[PDB]
Design an enzyme around this catalytic site. Structure first.
Site, PDB file in Angstrom:
ATOM      1  N   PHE D 126     -23.193  21.478  40.787  1.00 54.50           N
ATOM      2  CA  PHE D 126     -24.024  20.563  41.554  1.00 54.50           C
ATOM      3  C   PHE D 126     -23.135  19.743  42.477  1.00 54.50           C
ATOM      4  O   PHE D 126     -21.979  19.454  42.156  1.00 54.50           O
ATOM      5  CB  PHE D 126     -24.835  19.643  40.626  1.00 54.50           C
ATOM      6  N   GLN D 248     -31.418   6.826  49.389  1.00 56.32           N
ATOM      7  CA  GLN D 248     -30.880   8.173  49.472  1.00 56.32           C
ATOM      8  C   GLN D 248     -31.851   9.104  50.183  1.00 56.32           C
ATOM      9  O   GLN D 248     -33.069   8.990  50.035  1.00 56.32           O
ATOM     10  CB  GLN D 248     -30.582   8.719  48.078  1.00 56.32           C
ATOM     11  N   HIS D 250     -32.481  13.174  50.394  1.00 57.75           N
ATOM     12  CA  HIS D 250     -32.105  14.482  49.886  1.00 57.75           C
ATOM     13  C   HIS D 250     -31.880  15.418  51.066  1.00 57.75           C
ATOM     14  O   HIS D 250     -32.744  15.516  51.942  1.00 57.75           O
ATOM     15  CB  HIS D 250     -33.166  15.056  48.962  1.00 57.75           C
ATOM     16  N   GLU D 263     -31.129  20.887  44.943  1.00 52.53           N
ATOM     17  CA  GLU D 263     -29.743  21.053  45.353  1.00 52.53           C
ATOM     18  C   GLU D 263     -29.089  22.219  44.634  1.00 52.53           C
ATOM     19  O   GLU D 263     -28.085  22.753  45.120  1.00 52.53           O
ATOM     20  CB  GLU D 263     -28.967  19.762  45.091  1.00 52.53           C
ATOM     21  N   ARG D 294     -24.678  14.128  48.944  1.00 54.83           N
ATOM     22  CA  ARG D 294     -25.967  14.264  49.612  1.00 54.83           C
ATOM     23  C   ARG D 294     -25.990  13.503  50.930  1.00 54.83           C
ATOM     24  O   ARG D 294     -26.500  14.007  51.937  1.00 54.83           O
ATOM     25  CB  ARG D 294     -27.090  13.776  48.699  1.00 54.83           C
ATOM     26  N   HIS D 361     -35.431  10.231  48.993  1.00 51.83           N
ATOM     27  CA  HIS D 361     -35.544  10.842  47.677  1.00 51.83           C
ATOM     28  C   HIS D 361     -35.444   9.839  46.543  1.00 51.83           C
ATOM     29  O   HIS D 361     -36.291   9.842  45.641  1.00 51.83           O
ATOM     30  CB  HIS D 361     -34.458  11.912  47.535  1.00 51.83           C
ATOM     31  N   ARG D 406     -25.865   8.301  45.178  1.00 45.49           N
ATOM     32  CA  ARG D 406     -26.071   8.877  43.858  1.00 45.49           C
ATOM     33  C   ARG D 406     -25.599  10.323  43.837  1.00 45.49           C
ATOM     34  O   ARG D 406     -25.764  11.054  44.817  1.00 45.49           O
ATOM     35  CB  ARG D 406     -27.554   8.810  43.494  1.00 45.49           C
TER      36      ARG D 406
END
Ligand code: CDL
Ligand code: PC1
Ligand code: UQ8
Ligand code: FAD
Ligand code: SF4
Ligand code: F3S
Ligand code: FES
Ligand code: K
Lengths: 164, 87, 259, 604, 48, 82
Positions: D126, D248, D250, D263, D294, D361, D406
């Site tokens: 990730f 944030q 995405h 993701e 991100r 997101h 994040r």
């Protein structure tokens, strides 16, 4: 009881234990289970009491008899209350009419909240009277109250635990 | 109420009618055929050109006096003879 | 300019529910049904009430009956046509308001089967995740994806007749999910409890459950497997097993449970 | 049930603890509290399984060695670097050190994790995760259950709650908190949507496990129920809200629907391609092209579309090419993505690219908290003072584990760890059996009056119109790249939007599932949090993590490495103004196991 | 003060499926058989 | 209607109210009592039914086969039809 049969204590213990778990393991919520089985339980229970009479002080058979008797007491009490709830639900269904259309709708229950108050009070009495049978009480009477709660909005202590 | 042709109630009825009616009619017809098979052997319809000539022949063969026998015409193609002096 | 007919019921007035028709321009609306309902609420009649959250189809809160077949509004597509689109709550449910159903019984039934892993021995110290091979994990693929929308629950005729005695396609599917799971060690207890005429055998193989499942699961297939497994594995002592587990639940709080 | 008469029918409940939220964070806290033996009540707008944790796809990070050898210290360093050194290192150490245990406990309750050949939990790569304190390569730490890890987590936690027999007040909407004059929190006052009555829950310790405020923007991946109600309750109590500017985006969200594509799609080999067809992500963050943080990917995508290298008819989006990946792998480890693309995007993942665009997101900001999940009310003398009886967990709270940006799959870890931590903190403070809490005599008096006034509110502006206007400003005035002049204009606009909440009107006047009333109440929470986001963002004259400023394109650590607290002057959003204060960030880890991570460049 | 409504029978509007109809036919096989026997019994008594 | 509001519910196995569940049990006994009684019909038919062409059958055995041993010459076309 009028019988000439004789049983040893080991046999008497087995018969009493088998009946105790048969009653407790049965699903009391389904009305037909009690209708079909109760006649068999009573016939056996009469035999079990007769053969276990000399062992009411026995350290093994004694406790089984007390639990067996207590379970049968709870079964009859829960059946009676849930039987009344079924009548209330059936009355509500018939009041809907044919195809739920009201085509031949009957007369509604005019004192539904009073009945709910009466049933919940009985439900609380069972919990206090039979502290060791709550799982069975919730199965039959507790679930019945939840069904009624859909028809009518009333408050009972365990309402929040049934998602109400 | 809300009724739709594609409803379960209506579609089930059509499905039941299509499935059972052909079977039932065949089954009923078969029973009727069996009844006809026995009926024709026991008493087969027979056609007579003239009723009067046949009726006279019937009386002669059975030795029945025509006076005491009542003749009636139930239908256009059906004529029945009965005993006049019958309880 | 599609015409939308929406089931309406005011709990306070308690008047006879009726269908109210709205006209919406699909040009200024999203493809899905839920978009039309939101547009109606935003513009024409804000009183309309309905449960919605995800927009992706994962949560399963927007279950409704569109044109007679249950579905999730967020995944359902708007089909323009002369015939008005009819939107109603889930069949044979008590409507709290407008399209919002009363699914408390469904939640209570789900809690009954106790959907949490049970093991005879507690996790020993220093022990990592329980062993489970890929092959065993593959058995759960078609059953762990249920969103509990209750579309299948309200499409089963057996559930229409005996809602309070029949667990329904969704709850039975989840019960077999825990039975099938290799990690769970209470397989016999679960099968014994579910082996009831009302709980399980009211399923008559109608298959209205698999047809309407938004996520494409097969509750009918899973229900059939569970019956076959129970029939082959039944023993005279199952009734005692249920009783013993009931005694183990003696000190639990109120609510539906194993009993 | 009690039964009182405060213009409505008020049922007074008394409990040791009251969680407010049935998401991932809330469910874990309730199970923990009941396990510790304290009487608990969990309140939620929706049935617990329908919370937005269900929509989580990627997975949860843990330093298990199932795929490759890992160390929790390595995961902690990644989190600090991902936070861009605006995250509390005390909190990060606690989260990372507990991650292996938390995940394994979840599996112990029956979570259907995907399995490796040897039968261990499978983990995937990730974005933003590396080994050997960045010296090593990509790290496979994201424990997953196919593309439905959130669905599995929430169901398992709900099962855990059932096992412990937690008390759930489902379909109850939570109004303001009940606050003592001393400043303690004595519980919450809520409305039952199903029955229409008001309930006053009184508890020694309260946990706020509500969601974020992602619905304040036009295009979002958040649910319709993600109105950030818990934060508004804290703000109306006069307590601060922290780091609200850091929102944030995405990198991959289906365009125009806004639905998320995990993701993990890029984590399993997916590529992003521009109009030229170039894998543009090499130019930005070369070492980890598509696995960059991100915020870096989102900024690059926006710049590329701005440059004129967008795809599609209108040059408005970019493509995500998963077609080259094998069909078997796509079905095995990304099943949910294929169906979502097939429906909302009308795309066959195996053979076609997916249209994608950055979308809001997650909200890094939230109620200030320490490493023990206790809510904070900072003071000049004491920068870490704790509200006497309040706690927060989940996306609702800001322990600062995530800081400016994040890390993917780090949020689900935060839910369980701090949800578990919150229960432990309450257990220490509150004994299993204690005298019932004494509510103040006027408890809920103000809330009922406000609730009643909104119920009978009649005005020209409708709730839907006002919400649409608010979303328009936030989307336009607070994009991925924020310009100071726009932010200033947006700040004025949002202040006007606050004033016109006075004129909102609702046509419906019932109390049973009055969604029109509930939406109006939610809009109040949405407006106040949205206002603080703009004001906090405008004030911050730097570019850190998600917050990127074209006017100030640099990370000022000397004068801007400080959390940004925001205060609402008065309980009524109509009559209130936003005030900004700051508190320093905690950089020293609590234990010596994890060394301090000094600030450094964040290139990825 | 608030009461929930109860919907009508779903049979009137719920969409039908080919498998659902066939299942009803499967359950009605014996009912039809009794019906046919009754018809034949009546015909044997009232006809010809 | 108005259902009675003072019902004395059953408290134990020896203090029981009469309810429909008990009445159903009485139905079970009565329906099963019918099954015992109705069994007389099929048994009666088998015990009493006879299949004989005429009264000559008994006379033939009395005069030509009193011991059920007398063999008879078989001529297949008789009962074979052809
Ligand atoms: C391996 C597989 C094996 C499978 C095996 C399964 C076996 C199942 C067996 C079921 C029972 C069938 C028995 C049939 C017997 C009859 C045949 C017979 O014996 O013939 C020889 C012989 C009779 O032939 P016969 O020597 O020529 O003598 C003449 C008859 O006796 C003359 O008879 P009769 O005169 O004495 O009576 C006539 C008879 C016949 O009835 C009639 O004649 C009726 C006439 C009706 C006229 C109506 C007129 C209406 C006018 C309307 C006008 C409308 C105008 C509109 C105008 C519109 C203008 C626009 O009347 C009645 O029965 C009474 C009236 C009808 C009552 C019932 C009405 C309700 C019907 C309910 C139907 C249920 C199904 C519902 C379907 C739903 C579909 C969705 O039999 C006898 O003499 C004895 C009779 C009794 C025998 C009973 C044997 C019972 C065996 C039971 C075995 C059970 C096994 C299964 C398991 C165990 C279960 C417990
Ligand atoms: C241990 C196992 C116990 C199992 C018990 C099962 C019971 C089954 C009951 C079936 C009843 C069927 C009745 C049909 C009607 C008959 C009426 C009739 O005409 O009867 C007289 C006639 C007498 O025949 P007849 O030639 O004199 O002529 C009578 C007149 N005509 C010809 C017109 C009929 O026939 C019978 O007796 C019929 C057979 C009766 C068989 C009943 C069941 C027998 C079960 C035996 C159990 C064996 C136990 C094994 C272990 C032993 C250990 C020591
Ligand atoms: C009550 O709601 C229901 C349930 O509970 C929810 C069920 O579970 C179920 C499931 C139960 C089952 C499947 C058990 C089996 C059920 C069966 C066999 C069906 C039972 C129901 C019925 C038979 C319906 C009851 C009967 C009727 C509605 C009558 C039907 C006939 C009708 C309406 C025709 C009447 C028309 C008129 C009187 C109009 C007359 C017209 C004129 C006078 C016009 C004259 C004109 C001129 C020019 C002179 C059902 C079906 C249900 O309806
Ligand atoms: C599409 C999507 C995918 C994501 N995927 C991932 C991922 O793969 N990995 C990851 O780490 N993170 C992911 N995230 C982020 C993460 O899922 C969220 O931050 C997390 O779910 C927040 O959970 P929560 O428990 O704090 O609250 P939520 O899940 O947001 O829900 C809040 C709860 O509080 C209730 N509530 C709210 N307001 C009130 C009120 N007024 N009264 C009463 N109850 C109220 C709600 O009904 C709900 O029960 C994703 C986010 C989205 C939207
Ligand atoms: S089986 Fe399908 S329709 Fe039924 S509850 Fe689960 S997801 Fe919903
Ligand atoms: S429709 Fe119902 S009858 Fe069984 S096959 Fe499905 S649960
Ligand atoms: S809103 Fe949740 S499935 Fe559609
Ligand atoms: K198993």
């Amino acid at each position: 009881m009028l019988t000439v049969d004789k049983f040893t204590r080991a046999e008497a213990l087995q018969r009493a234990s088998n009946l105790y778990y048969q009653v407790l393991g049965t699903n009391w919520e389904d009305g037909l289970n009690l209708v079909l089985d109760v006649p068999f339980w009573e016939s056996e229970l009469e035999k079990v009491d007769h053969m276990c009479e000399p062992y009411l002080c026995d350290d093994e058979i004694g406790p089984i008899i007390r639990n067996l008797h207590e379970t049968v007491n709870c079964m009859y009490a829960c059946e009676d209350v849930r039987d009344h709830i079924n009548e209330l639900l059936e009355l509500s269904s018939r009041a809907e009419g044919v195809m739920g259309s009201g085509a031949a709708a009957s007369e509604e229950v005019e004192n539904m909240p009073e009945q709910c108050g009466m049933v919940t009070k009985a439900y609380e009495d069972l919990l206090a009277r039979y502290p060791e049978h709550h799982p069975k009480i919730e199965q039959t009477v507790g679930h019945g109250l939840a069904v009624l709660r859909q028809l009518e909005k009333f408050n009972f202590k365990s309402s929040h635990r049934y998602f109400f | 109420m809300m009724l739709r042709y594609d409803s379960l109630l209506w579609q089930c009825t059509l499905a039941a009618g299509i499935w059972f009616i052909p079977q039932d009619v065949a089954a009923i017809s078969a029973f009727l055929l069996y009844g006809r098979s026995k009926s024709r052997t026991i008493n087969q319809p027979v056609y007579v050109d003239n009723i009067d000539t046949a009726a006279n022949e019937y009386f002669k063969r059975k030795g029945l006096d025509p006076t005491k026998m009542i003749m009636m015409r139930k239908s256009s193609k059906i004529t029945e003879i009965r005993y006049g002096e019958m309880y | 300019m599609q015409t939308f007919r929406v089931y309406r019921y005011d709990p306070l007035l308690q008047d006879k529910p009726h269908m109210q028709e709205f006209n919406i321009d699909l040009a200024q609306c999203g493809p899905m049904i839920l978009d039309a309902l939101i547009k109606i609420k935003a513009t024409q009649d804000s009183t309309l009430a309905f449960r919605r959250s995800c927009r992706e189809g994962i949560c399963g809160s927007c279950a409704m009956n569109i044109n007679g077949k249950n579905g999730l509004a967020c995944l359902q597509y708007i089909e323009p046509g002369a015939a008005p689109i009819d939107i109603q709550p889930l069949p044979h449910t008590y409507v709290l308001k407008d399209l919002v159903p009363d699914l408390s019984n469904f939640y209570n039934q789900y809690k009954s089967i106790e959907p949490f892993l049970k093991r005879r021995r507690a996790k020993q110290p220093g022990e990592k995740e329980y062993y489970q091979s890929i092959e065993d994990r593959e058995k759960l693929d078609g059953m762990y994806e249920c969103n509990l929308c209750a579309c299948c629950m309200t499409s089963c005729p057996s559930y229409w007749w005996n809602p309070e005695y029949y667990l329904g396609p969704a709850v039975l599917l989840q019960a077999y999910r825990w039975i099938a799971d290799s990690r769970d060690e209470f397989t016999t207890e679960r099968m014994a409890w579910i082996n009831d005429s009302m709980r399980l055998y009211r399923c008559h193989g109608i298959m209205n459950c698999t047809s309407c499942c938004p996520k494409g699961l097969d509750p009918a297939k899973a229900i059939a497997k569970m019956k076959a497994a129970i029939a082959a594995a039944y023993e005279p002592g199952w009734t005692k097993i249920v009783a013993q587990e009931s005694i183990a639940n003696k000190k639990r709080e109120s609510g539906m449970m194993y009993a | 049930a009690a039964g009182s008469g405060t213009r409505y029918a008020v049922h007074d409940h008394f409990y040791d603890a009251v969680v407010v939220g049935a998401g991932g964070a809330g469910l874990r806290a309730a199970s923990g509290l009941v396990a510790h033996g304290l009487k608990t009540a969990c309140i939620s707008k929706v049935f617990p399984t329908r919370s937005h944790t269900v929509a989580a796809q990627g997975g949860i990070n843990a330093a298990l060695g199932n795929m490759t050898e890992d160390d929790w210290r390595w995961h902690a360093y990644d989190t600090v670097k991902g936070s861009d050194w605006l995250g509390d290192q005390d909190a990060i150490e606690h989260m990372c050190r507990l991650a292996p245990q938390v995940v394994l406990e979840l599996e112990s309750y029956g979570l259907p994790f995907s399995r490796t050949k040897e039968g261990k939990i499978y983990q995937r790569a990730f974005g933003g995760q590396s080994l050997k304190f960045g010296k090593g390569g990509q790290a496979y730490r994201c424990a997953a259950a196919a593309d439905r890890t959130g669905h599995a987590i929430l169901h398992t936690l709900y099962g855990m709650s059932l096992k412990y027999d937690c008390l759930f007040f489902i379909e109850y909407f939570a109004l303001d908190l009940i606050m003592d004059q001393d400043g303690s929190c004595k519980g919450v006052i809520a409305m039952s949507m199903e029955d229409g009555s008001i309930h006053r829950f009184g508890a020694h310790q309260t946990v706020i496990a509500t969601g974020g405020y992602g619905r304040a923007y036009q295009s979002c991946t958040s649910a319709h129920t993600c109105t950030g109600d818990g934060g508004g309750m804290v703000s109306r109590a006069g307590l601060p809200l922290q780091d609200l500017e850091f929102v944030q985006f995405h990198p991959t969200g289906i365009f125009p629907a806004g639905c998320l594509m995990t993701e993990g799609c890029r984590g399993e080999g997916g590529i992003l391609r521009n109009s030229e067809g170039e894998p543009f992500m090499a130019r930005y963050a070369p070492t980890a092209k598509d696995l960059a943080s991100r915020d870096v990917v989102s900024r690059a995508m926006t710049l590329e579309i701005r440059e004129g290298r967008g795809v599609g008819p209108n040059k408005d989006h970019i493509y995500l090419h998963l077609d080259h990946l094998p069909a078997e792998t796509l079905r095995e480890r990304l099943p949910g993505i294929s169906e979502t693309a097939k429906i909302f995007a009308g795309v066959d993942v195996t053979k076609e690219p997916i249209p994608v665009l950055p979308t809001v997101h997650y909200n890094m900001g939230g109620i200030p908290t320490n490493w023990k999940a206790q809510c904070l009310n900072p003071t000049s003398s004491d920068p870490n003072k704790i509200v006497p009886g309040l706690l927060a967990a989940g996306e609702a709270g800001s322990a600062s584990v995530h800081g400016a940006n994040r890390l993917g799959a780090n949020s689900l870890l935060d839910l369980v760890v701090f949800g578990r931590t919150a229960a432990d903190t309450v257990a220490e403070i509150v004994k299993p059996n204690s005298p019932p809490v004494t509510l103040p005599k006027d408890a809920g008096g103000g809330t009922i009056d406000r609730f009643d006034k909104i119920r009978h509110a009649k005005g020209p502006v409708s709730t839907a119109d006002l919400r649409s206007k608010l979303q328009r400003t936030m989307q336009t005035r607070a994009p991925v790249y924020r310009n100071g002049d726009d932010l200033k204009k947006g700040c004025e606009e949002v202040r006007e939007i606050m004033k016109e909440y006075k004129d909102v009107g609702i046509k419906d006047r019932t109390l049973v599932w009055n969604t029109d009333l509930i939406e109006t109440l939610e809009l109040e929470n949405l407006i106040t949090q949205a206002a603080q986001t703009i004001v906090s963002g405008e004030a911050r004259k730097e570019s850190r993590g998600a917050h990127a400023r074209e006017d100030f394109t640099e990370r000022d650590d000397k004068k801007w490495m400080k959390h940004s607290l925001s205060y609402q002057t008065k309980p009524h959003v109509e009559e209130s103004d936003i005030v900004l204060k700051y508190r320093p960030v905690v950089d020293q880890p609590l234990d010596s196991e994890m060394h301090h991570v000094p600030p450094a460049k964040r290139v990825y | 003060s608030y009461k929930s409504a109860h919907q009508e029978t779903p049979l009137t509007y719920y969409r039908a499926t080919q498998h659902a109809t066939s299942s009803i036919n499967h359950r009605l096989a014996y009912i039809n058989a009794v019906f046919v026997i009754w018809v034949c019994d009546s015909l044997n008594d009232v006809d010809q | 209607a108005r259902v009675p509001e003072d019902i004395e519910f059953t408290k134990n196995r020896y203090t029981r109210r009469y309810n429909l569940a008990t009445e159903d049990r009485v139905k079970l006994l009565n329906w099963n009592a019918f099954c015992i009684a109705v069994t007389a019909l099929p048994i009666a038919y088998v015990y009493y039914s006879w299949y004989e062409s005429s009264e000559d059958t008994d006379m033939i055995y009395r005069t030509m086969d009193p011991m059920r041993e007398a063999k008879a010459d078989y001529y297949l076309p008789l009962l074979r039809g052809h």
